């Protein structure tokens, strides 16, 4: 009986899917601006014994 429910209320995932996709695209855009990661005179530091990058 879930067929009628799905066809009547499947538009209720469009906005949440858009939100999660927008979060992903924001992270992807963030990934392209790492030219100064751990290079600022204010936030430069020595790396922790295990970590790789200061921020993602």
Partner 1 sequence: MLKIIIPTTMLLPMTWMSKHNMIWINATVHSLLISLISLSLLNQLGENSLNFSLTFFSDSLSAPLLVLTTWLLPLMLMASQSHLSKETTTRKKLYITMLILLQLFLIMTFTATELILFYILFEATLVPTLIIITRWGNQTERLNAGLYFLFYTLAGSLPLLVALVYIQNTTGSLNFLIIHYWSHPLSNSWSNIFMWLACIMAFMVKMPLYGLHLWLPKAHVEAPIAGSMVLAAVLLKLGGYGMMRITTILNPLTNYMAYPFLMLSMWGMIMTSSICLRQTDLKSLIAYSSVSHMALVIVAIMIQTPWSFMGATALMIAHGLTSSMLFCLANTNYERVHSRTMILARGLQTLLPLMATWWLVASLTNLALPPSINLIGELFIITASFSWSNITIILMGMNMMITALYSLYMLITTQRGKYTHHINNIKPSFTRENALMALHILPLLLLTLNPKMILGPLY
Partner 2 sequence: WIARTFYDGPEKNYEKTMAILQIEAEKAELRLKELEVRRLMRARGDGPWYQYPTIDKALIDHSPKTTPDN
Ligand X SMILES: CCCCCCCCCCCCCCCCCC(=O)OC[C@H](COP(=O)([O-])OCC(O)COP(=O)([O-])OC[C@@H](COC(=O)CCCCCCCCCCCCCCCCC)OC(=O)CCCCCCCCCCCCCCCCC)OC(=O)CCCCCCCCCCCCCCCCC
Site residues for ligand PLX per CB under 6 A: 23, 27
Q: Which residues contact 55 (CB under 8 A, 6 or more apart)?
A: 37
Site for partner 2 in 1-56 (CB under 8 A): 30, 33-40, 42-43, 54-56
DSSP string, 7-50: HHHGGGGHHHHHHHHHHHHHHHHHTT--TTTTTSTTT--PPPSS
In the complex, the smallest distance separating the C-beta of residue 45 from partner 2, rounded to whole angstroms, is: 9
Q: Which is nearer to ligand X, 14 or 35 (CB)?
A: 14
Q: Which of 17, 20, 35, 42 binds ligand X (CB under 6 A)?
A: 17
């Amino acid at each position: 009986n879930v067929l009628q429910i799905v066809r009547d209320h499947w538009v209720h995932i469009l906005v949440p899917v858009g939100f999660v996709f927008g979060c992903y695209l924001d992270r992807r855009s963030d990934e392209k601006l790492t030219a100064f990661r751990n290079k600022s005179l204010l936030f430069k530091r020595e790396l922790r014994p295990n970590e790789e990058v200061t921020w993602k």
